[PDB]
């Protein structure tokens, strides 16, 4: 375990071998995902005719509208993905990150250098990706009539989100770096608990303060829908406070619905794109019954317990690997071993195989968690209304019913429409 790690090679290097290992993995994962992308792109180009099983789900006009849309999305997804994978590789090989660290110079001094390094890194991040983002909304989402955004709204929102990002990023990072540099030798427990507080605080704050800045939040008007939601909320013993209708129709024709809170103060959030055109009151309640299922089946609580179990395991292995000067020298840091750089190298590159496996396992769990929430909706009796809703929402978001099994197994957090509909038909 430790005696085998001290062995030296008279044929191969040490720091250079682990750096290449990072890039070799990053490219094999990319090539695996590109193979999967190619596999699913073939499905869109081959299946031009509507299947007999998916015949009642979408008509030939809606199916070809969905086919064209998913095809344009696949083409963009490749080139935008290829540019990113090339950029990451090139910045690493060219030695961007250490040189940027030198340029953000000239414990308080290191935290300041880290803070300005972060500010510049996210500035380049935002600007380099903005043309791709502008293309997706104004060419893909606009061609297939989803986008409702103007160039002004897109621009004003980009700055709004970028500013709010820094105002959260800068204080959290400066306080996080402080705990690692000051604390010890068990600094990882104090750093993990800080991120634990920051995570749960941002979860409750987001929809109540951060989210109403970018999108128009208004309380749901009193009616047949507003009354029936409260009846369902009291039935499941869900402590409902308020019901909101988000102006999602200002951005895109895409529908959404979720809940948020801490304990006795829970609130339901609906999109106007889901209520208007959208879904009928009977279908909306069934969609809510599914989302309320995640609350009742404790999917919400289980997902937090997994996320904090992952960060504990990560901060522990970080505390074990932060002392190793070999991983810093690998990426071009020879003169110093900075804390923020250590967080970047270990969490985003050394943990890359673990992070990829954990993500796959959580995607498998998410699919199982969705089926359980669909089974809960059937247990409420709204199985027939959810069956109709899932199809109507799929037609609204031009979702292709056919999908490559290997692609959906790896990527899809939600199981395929035909798989979800068959489970509801059986119930």
Partner interacting with residue 373 (select from ligand PC1, Zn ion, none; CB below 5-8 Å by kind): Zn ion
Kindly tell me which of 83 and 312 has the beta carbon lying closer to ligand PC1.
312
Q: Residue 239 belongs to what H/E stretch?
A: none
312 sits near ligand PC1 (criterion: CB under 6 A): yes
Q: Which stretch binds Zn ion (CB under 5 A): 7-15, 202-210, 238-246, 365-373?
A: 365-373
Q: What is the DSSP string of 255-322?
A: --EEEEESSS-EEEEEEHHHH-----HHHHHHHHHHHHHHHHTTHHHHHHHHHHHHHHHHHHHHHHHT
Kindly tell me which of 283 and 370 has the beta carbon lying closer to Zn ion.
370
200 sits near ligand PC1 (criterion: CB under 6 A): yes
* Of 154, 149, 107, 128, the residue nearest 340 (C-alpha): 107
Q: What is the DSSP string of 58-108?
A: --HHHHHHHHHHHHHHHHHHHHHHHHHHHHHHHHHHHTHHHHHHHHT---H
Kindly tell me which of 205 and 357 has the beta carbon lying closer to ligand PC1.
205
Q: What is the C-alpha separation between 102 and 225, in angstroms, rounded? A: 59
Long-range contacts of 277-284 (CB under 8 A, 24+ apart): 278/392, 278/396, 279/255, 279/389, 279/392, 279/393, 281/224, 281/225, 281/228, 282/382, 282/385, 283/385, 283/386, 283/388, 283/389, 283/392, 284/225, 284/257, 284/389
Could you tell me which residues are beta bridge partners of residue 258? Answer: 269
Q: How far is the CB of 370 from Zn ion (least distance, A)?
A: 5
377 sits near Zn ion (criterion: CB under 5 A): no
Angle between helices 383-396 and 281-296 (to 10 degrees): 100
262 sits near ligand PC1 (criterion: CB under 6 A): yes
- Report the binding-site residues for Zn(2+): 290, 294, 370
11 is catalytic: no
Could you tell me which residues are beta bridge partners of residue 240? Answer: 266
304 sits near ligand PC1 (criterion: CB under 6 A): yes
397 sits near ligand PC1 (criterion: CB under 6 A): no
Q: Convert residues 330-359 into a mask of x (bound to ligand PC1 by CB under 6 A) and - (unbound).
A: ------------------------------
Partner interacting with residue 305 (select from Zn ion, ligand PC1, none; CB below 5-8 Å by kind): ligand PC1
- Report the binding-site residues: 290, 294, 370
Phi, psi of 360 (to 5 degrees): -65, -45
Question: Can you tell me which of 58, 225, 284, 373 binds Zn ion, judged by CB under 5 A?
Answer: 373
- Please name the residues in contact with 172: beta carbons below 8 A apart, sequence gap of 6 or more: 198
Kindly tell me which of 22 and 207 has the beta carbon lying closer to ligand PC1.
207
Kindly tell me which of 233 and 257 has the beta carbon lying closer to Zn ion.
257
204 sits near ligand PC1 (criterion: CB under 6 A): yes
- Please name the residues in contact with 28: beta carbons below 8 A apart, sequence gap of 6 or more: none
Phi, psi of 323 (to 5 degrees): -70, -25
Partner interacting with residue 304 (select from Zn ion, ligand PC1, none; CB below 5-8 Å by kind): ligand PC1
Kindly tell me which of 139 and 301 has the beta carbon lying closer to ligand PC1.
301
Q: How far is the CB of 386 from Zn ion (least distance, A)?
A: 11
Question: Can you tell me which of 308, 337, 388, 422 binds ligand PC1, judged by CB under 6 A?
Answer: 308
Pick the catalytic residue: 64, 228, 291, 419?
291
281 sits near ligand PC1 (criterion: CB under 6 A): no
Q: How far is the CB of 200 from ligand PC1 (least distance, A)?
A: 4
Q: Could you give the C-alpha distances from 360 to 47, 122, 295, 357, in angstroms and in order?
A: 27, 27, 23, 5
Q: Which stretch binds Zn ion (CB under 5 A): 145-153, 198-206, 306-314, 364-372?
A: 364-372
Q: Residue 131 belongs to what H/E stretch?
A: helix 108-135
Partner interacting with residue 406 (select from Zn ion, ligand PC1, none; CB below 5-8 Å by kind): none
For ligand PC1, the binding residues (CB under 6 A) are 200-201, 204, 262, 301, 304-305, 308-309, 312
For Zn ion, the binding residues (CB under 5 A) are 370, 373
Instruction: Supply the residues annotated as catalytic.
Output: 291
């Amino acid at each position: 375990g430790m005696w085998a790690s001290l062995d030296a090679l008279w044929e191969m290097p040490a720091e250079k071998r682990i750096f290449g290992a990072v890039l070799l993995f990053s490219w094999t994962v990319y090539l695996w995902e590109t193979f999967l992308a190619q596999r699913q792109r073939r499905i869109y180009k081959t299946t031009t005719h509507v299947p007999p099983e998916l015949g009642q789900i979408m008509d030939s006009e809606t199916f070809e509208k969905s086919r064209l849309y998913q095809l344009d999305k696949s083409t963009f997804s490749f080139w935008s993905g290829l540019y990113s994978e090339t950029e990451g590789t090139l910045i690493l090989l060219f030695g961007g990150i250490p040189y940027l660290w030198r340029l953000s110079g000239r414990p308080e001094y290191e935290i300041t250098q880290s803070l300005v390094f972060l500010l510049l890194a996210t500035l380049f991040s935002a600007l380099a990706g903005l043309p791709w983002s502008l293309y997706n909304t104004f060419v893909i989402e606009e061609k297939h009539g989803f986008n409702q955004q103007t160039l002004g709204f897109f621009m004003k929102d980009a700055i709004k989100k970028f500013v709010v990002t820094q105002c959260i990023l800068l204080p959290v990072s400066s306080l996080l770096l402080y705990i690692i540099k000051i604390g010890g030798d068990y600094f990882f427990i104090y750093a993990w608990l800080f991120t634990l507080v920051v995570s749960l605080v941002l979860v409750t704050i987001y929809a109540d303060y951060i989210a109403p800045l970018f999108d128009k939040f208004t309380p749901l008007p009193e009616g047949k829908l507003k009354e029936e939601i409260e009846v369902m909320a009291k039935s499941i013993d869900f402590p409902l406070t308020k019901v909101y209708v988000v102006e999602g129709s200002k951005r895109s024709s895409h529908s959404n619905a979720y809940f948020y809170g801490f304990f006795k103060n829970k609130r339901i959030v609906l999109f106007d794109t889901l209520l208007e055109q959208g879904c009928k009151n009977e279908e909306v309640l069934a969609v809510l019954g599914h989302e309320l299922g995640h609350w009742k089946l404790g999917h919400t609580v289980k997902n937090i317990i997994i996320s904090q179990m992952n960060s504990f395991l990560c901060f522990f292995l970080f505390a074990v690997l932060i002392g190793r000067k070999e991983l810093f020298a690998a990426f071009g840091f020879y003169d110093s071993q900075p804390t923020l750089i250590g967080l970047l190298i270990i969490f985003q590159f050394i943990f890359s195989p673990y992070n990829e496996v954990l993500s796959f396992c959580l995607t498998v769990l998410s699919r199982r968690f969705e089926f359980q929430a669909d089974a809960f909706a059937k247990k409420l009796g709204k199985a027939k209304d959810l069956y109709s809703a899932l199809i109507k929402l799929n037609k609204d978001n031009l979702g292709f019913p056919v999908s490559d099994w290997l692609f959906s197994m790896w990527h899809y957090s939600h199981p395929p429409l035909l798989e979800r509909l068959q489970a509801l038909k059986t119930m």
